[PDB]
Amino acid sequence: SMHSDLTFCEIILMEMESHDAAWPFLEPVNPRLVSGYRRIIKNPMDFSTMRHRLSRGGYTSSEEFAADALLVFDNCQTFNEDDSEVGKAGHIMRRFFESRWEEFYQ
Numbered sequence: 001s002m003h004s005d006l007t008f009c010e011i012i013l014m015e016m017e018s019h020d021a022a023w024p025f026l027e028p029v030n031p032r033l034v035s036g037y038r039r040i041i042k043n044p045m046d047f048s049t050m051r052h053r054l055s056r057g058g059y060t061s062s063e064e065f066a067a068d069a070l071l072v073f074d075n076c077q078t079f080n081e082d083d084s085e086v087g088k089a090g091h092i093m094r095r096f097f098e099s100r101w102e103e104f105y106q
Ligand SMILES: CC(=O)c1c(C)[nH]c(C(=O)N[C@H]2CCCC[C@H]2n2cc(CO)nn2)c1C
Pocket: 023, 024, 025, 027, 028, 029, 030, 031, 033, 034, 037, 075, 076, 079, 080, 086
């Protein structure tokens, strides 16, 4: 149901927000500090924005919630080198998200 889908999304988001590797993703990237970011990344996303939307009925399906989570990790992979601290954290967080998603939904 939508209710169970969104209940599970909230649990997964809480686990992501609390994860050791979540530090790059808790708040929107500030374009004033990261040259190129606003110009290059057309669809920015972060966990605080997801929490705002989720808490206010912004997601009507769990598929759309996952689309925003994957945007966080796709943007990170686009912009950051794989060996960088942020890039490494993105790979860790994507693997964690995918594993938890399959537990709850499949
Ligand atoms: C480019 C990128 O993909 C990225 C992500 C997803 N995360 C961060 C990040 O955490 N960078 C901090 C370290 C030094 C630069 C600025 C810091 N910082 C804070 C804010 C606003 O919170 N924006 N950038 C980056 C740099």
